[PDB]
Design a protein around this ligand. Structure first.
Ligand SMILES: Cc1cc(C(=O)NC2C[C@H]3CC[C@@H](C2)N3c2ccc(C(=O)NCc3ccccc3)cn2)c(C)cc1C(N)=O
Ligand SMILES: Cc1cc(C(=O)N[C@H]2C[C@H]3CC[C@@H](C2)N3c2ccc(C(=O)NCc3ccccc3)cn2)c(C)cc1C(N)=O
Lengths: 204, 204
């Protein structure tokens, strides 16, 4: 297990998100879904030129998996995934410029999507986030952070995913509404209704 | 015809775009298409609760119209459109915040879309941009700017368009490749292939 400090601007952003009240928290799910759709576009695109890109799974979809007993909500997709270098250095699209711009605006949280840093909105509702991912060019890895300025990265030895990403939200005790069938369905209807990939809720 | 000053940060960004060399200019079309898709999502959403929103036209689509005689490329959609207030005040999601820090990041251009000011990438290729638009709640208007720090807004008495927006790019003399069928086809393929509305490229 390797532990890393966040980029300064990312540490800054995560604290602002965690330590300030924001009403319109439900947008975290829009952001996670939007990320999944983007990752699905990227693998689909690659597969046009080279169909073997889909040897790791042909299906292109997004699954929402609430678990009341674990108090986790997990957003799963069969997108391009992330390599170890992605998990350590962050994605090219997440520049300190997008971050800095956003924080200044903050001081609606929904504008977070605009700036490439939508993932961090998960920390509106979750005390810990685990990201398990498999990119065609790399091994399966787990990235995890409870915020507080650091994250971890390890090779993942669990269940194989073929290709794609699972984002596991370990929810805060006052944010269990996001585990409810009715609530998840209304959020998807309001913010993610025209996403070009099937979104399936795994009812408990 | 009313003439308005640009927001200082928008005026600065437009100067940067016009007066700086950038290589990967084709991304202007991805940005215009993205905006059209977003405008279409918006009217489609409103129609779900109120079918009469589509009295101004039920078809939800995007047209690309090269004109080699006029040296214009026109991006048309049947999306929600913009009101006169939108044309004067700008859109709520275009704010100095996303603008100011993006310029700093510059000093690839493709990062523009992820700061909510993707429209202005049109000035990479166009010496003037005319925007004709019709929203359910307003009259038809023409917005136009050749940059230099100002824009114009007037009623458009011309061809009644139903609902939606036309973005007319009056291309620079050295940017006429964007009128060629093959070039437009290839740009849509690389960047807008999975947009969830029909994109129709007109033949000349
Ligand atoms: C979704 C969409 C968005 C756009 C877009 O970005 N529209 C804009 C509003 C209009 C038309 C083009 C440009 C940006 N516009 C403006 C309008 C006003 C201003 C402005 O600076 N106004 C003065 C101001 C001063 C001080 C503070 C704020 C504004 C700048 N750009 C466009 C052009 C089309 C679509 C579409 N296909 O539906
Ligand atoms: C498209 C997509 C994007 C994301 C996402 O935004 N991923 C990130 C990469 C990983 C996993 C979560 C978070 C942001 N991550 C990181 C990684 C590194 C860092 C970081 O700060 N690293 C140190 C650093 C120091 C100095 C300069 C640059 C980096 C921050 N966030 C995720 C989690 C999933 C998807 C998806 N469904 O495919």
């Amino acid at each position: 297990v390797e532990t890393f400090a966040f980029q300064a601007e990312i540490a800054q952003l995560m604290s602002l998100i965690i330590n300030t009240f924001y009403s319109n928290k439900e947008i975290f799910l829009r952001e996670l879904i939007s990320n999944s759709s983007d990752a699905l576009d990227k693998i689909r695109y690659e597969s046009l030129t080279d169909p073997s890109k889909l040897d790791s799974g042909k299906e292109l979809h997004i699954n929402l998996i609430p678990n009341k007993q674990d108090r986790t909500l997990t957003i799963v997709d069969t997108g391009i995934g992330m390599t170890k270098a992605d998990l350590i250095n962050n994605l090219g699209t997440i520049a300190k410029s997008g971050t800095k711009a956003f924080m200044e605006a903050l001081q609606d949280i929904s504008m977070i999507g605009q700036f490439g840093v939508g993932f961090y909105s998960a920390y509106l509702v979750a005390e810990k986030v685990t990201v398990i991912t498999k990119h065609n060019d790399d091994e399966q890895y787990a990235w995890e952070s409870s915020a507080g300025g650091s994250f971890t990265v390890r090779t993942d030895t669990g269940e194989p995913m073929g290709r794609g990403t699972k984002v596991i939200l370990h929810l805060k005790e006052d944010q269990t509404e996001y585990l409810e069938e009715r609530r998840i369905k209304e959020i998807v209807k309001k913010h993610s209704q025209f996403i070009g990939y099937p979104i399936t809720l795994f009812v408990e």
